[PDB]
Amino acid sequence: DWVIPPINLPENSRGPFPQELVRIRSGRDKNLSLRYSVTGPGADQPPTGIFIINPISGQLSVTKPLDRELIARFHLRAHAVDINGNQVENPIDIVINVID
Amino acid sequence: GSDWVIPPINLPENSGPFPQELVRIRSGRDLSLRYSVTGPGADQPPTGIFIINPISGQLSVTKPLDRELIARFHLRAHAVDINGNQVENPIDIVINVI
Numbered sequence: 001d002w003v004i005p006p007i008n009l010p011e012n013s014r015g016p017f018p019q020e021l022v023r024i025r026s027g028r029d030k031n032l033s034l035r036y037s038v039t040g041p042g043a044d045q046p047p048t049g050i051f052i053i054n055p056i057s058g059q060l061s062v063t064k065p066l067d068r069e070l071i072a073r074f075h076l077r078a079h080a081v082d083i084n085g086n087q088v089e090n091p092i093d094i095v096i097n098v099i100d
Numbered sequence: 101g102s103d104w105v106i107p108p109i110n111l112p113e114n115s116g117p118f119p120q121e122l123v124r125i126r127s128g129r130d131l132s133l134r135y136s137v138t139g140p141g142a143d144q145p146p147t148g149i150f151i152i153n154p155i156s157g158q159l160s161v162t163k164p165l166d167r168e169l170i171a172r173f174h175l176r177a178h179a180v181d182i183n184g185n186q187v188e189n190p191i192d193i194v195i196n197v198i
């Protein structure tokens with residue numbers, strides 16, 4: 001399937017935090033109410049809580065200043081589910097690069 | 101609770117009608133929280149066997165099961181506020197097909 005272009009993020013960010021990155025959504029959401037989620041190292045696996053996504057808008061943010069010298073890349077996966085919990089789309093890979 | 105482990109869920113093979121509601125996994129703090137499950141059986145193959153209601157926390161099975169093919173699943177439930185922030189620590193869920 002089509003690959004979402006990776007993000008580039010300057011290390012030592014100053015926010016203010018949370019600092020909005022990009023919105024990851026399904027076009028079919030304003031047709032069918034969808035609930036968004038994100039998994040992987042940086043989201044729900046260590047380090048937890050660095051990348052969050054709004055359940056309704058699908059807007060993703062970073063919660064703190066990054067450092068490439070400690071970790072230069074994160075690979076997450078966005079999910080979309082209906083009001084019942086049935087996944088509507090397959091999981092999409094999200095790539096983020098810390099730069100400096 | 102704060103590290104108490106949830107007892108395994110035992111479900112008989114050859115089950116309906118579906119989706120068949122199993123058990124409610126929720127956080128007493130439900131503040132409007134949203135629930136989601138991860139792992140083999142949910143968002144990893146075999147995909148879509150189990151699903152959780154975003155608002156209620158009701159875990160359901162979607163089709164019949166067979167012990168001889170897969171004997172048990174190991175999922176993880178999550179809780180996140182209306183803004184996506186993690187509020188609870190994810191819990192492990194074990195399902196044994198009998």
Ligand SMILES: [Yb+3]
Nearest residue numbers: 011068069100
């Ligand atoms: Yb640096």
Ligand SMILES: [Yb+3]
Nearest residue numbers: 113166167168
């Ligand atoms: Yb059997």
